């Protein structure tokens, strides 16, 4: 099926399939299915068009994909523009939540660089 603009897997159960959308986790999928009425373990290929429409309508009430990406970018850019300590860390591409930088910062600062 194609939900919220992406093609989710068809053979996987509904809860696992719906977490393939940027902005939906297991809890959110678990709540959407409960709200609509579809059983948790039903495969995607076994849903009818009306149930697919119901899921597609339920997905509309939470931020997803492009909108959520835009909002996160807006927050980070606002921090960098303002210039507080957190924005300075974002500019420098260093840890933002107070972790040590003497060692062990490879996720933020990328692979090692020779001198």
């Amino acid at each position: 099926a194609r939900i919220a603009g992406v093609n989710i897997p068809d053979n996987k159960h509904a809860v696992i399939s719906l977490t393939y959308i940027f902005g939906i986790g297991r809890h959110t999928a678990k709540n959407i299915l409960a709200a609509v009425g579809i059983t948790e373990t039903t495969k995607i290929r076994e849903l009818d068009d009306a149930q697919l429409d119901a899921i597609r309508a339920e997905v509309a009430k939470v931020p997803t994909e492009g909108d959520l990406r835009r909002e996160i970018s807006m927050n980070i850019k606002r921090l960098m523009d303002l210039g507080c300590y957190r924005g300075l860390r974002h500019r420098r591409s260093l840890p933002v939540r107070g972790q040590r930088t003497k060692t062990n910062a490879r996720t933020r600062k990328g692979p090692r660089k020779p001198i």
Binding site: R2, G5, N7, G66
Partner: protein, 174 residues
């Protein structure tokens, strides 16, 4: 469309622009579809994919556009083919416009993607639509990678305001 423009949009546009003569009423002449593919001579599979996509989006057989001149910077020579193009006129272009404004725009994630201006000062409009998807075609399985596309609407309007009036009458967002 067709009958709609023939029956009301003509007099409605004449009212809108205070046009003196029936011929000075703007009309839309042709719609041209273009794909420009680089490195086509490398494989030619992407070229066949381009001609296939064109044949589905527009119910006409495309023609491949050959390279003119030979660029050292790119890997092209004047011999190789580097694109595909189609021209739509009359009923075909009218149905293409109808299907476009019906299906494509709702499906694309960004909304009101066409800007306000996008004008050459000649009443001719151009839009660049990303990905060959967002059109009635084969499902995502059993197709190649997405390919962007260029739509160009060439009209008899003399000025940009006349072009904008024609598009708004047709229902174009801008």
């Amino acid at each position: 469309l067709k009958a709609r423009y023939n029956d009301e949009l003509k007099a409605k546009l004449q009212e809108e622009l205070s046009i003196k003569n029936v011929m000075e009423i703007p009309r839309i002449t042709k719609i041209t579809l273009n794909m420009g593919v680089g490195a086509a001579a490398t494989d030619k599979k992407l070229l066949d994919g381009a001609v296939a996509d064109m044949q589905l989006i527009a119910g006409q057989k495309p023609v491949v556009t050959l390279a003119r001149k030979s660029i050292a910077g790119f890997k092209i020579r004047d011999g190789w083919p580097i694109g595909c193009k189609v021209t739509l006129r009359g009923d075909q272009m009218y149905e293409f416009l109808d299907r476009l404004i019906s299906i494509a725009i709702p499906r694309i994630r960004d909304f009101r993607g066409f800007s306000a201006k996008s004008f050459d000062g000649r009443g001719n409009y151009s839009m660049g639509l990303k990905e060959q998807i967002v059109f009635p075609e084969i499902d995502f399985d059993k197709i190649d990678r997405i390919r962007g596309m260029d739509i160009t609407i060439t009209t008899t309007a003399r000025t940009d305001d006349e072009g904008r009036a024609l598009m708004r009458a047709f229902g174009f967002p801008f």
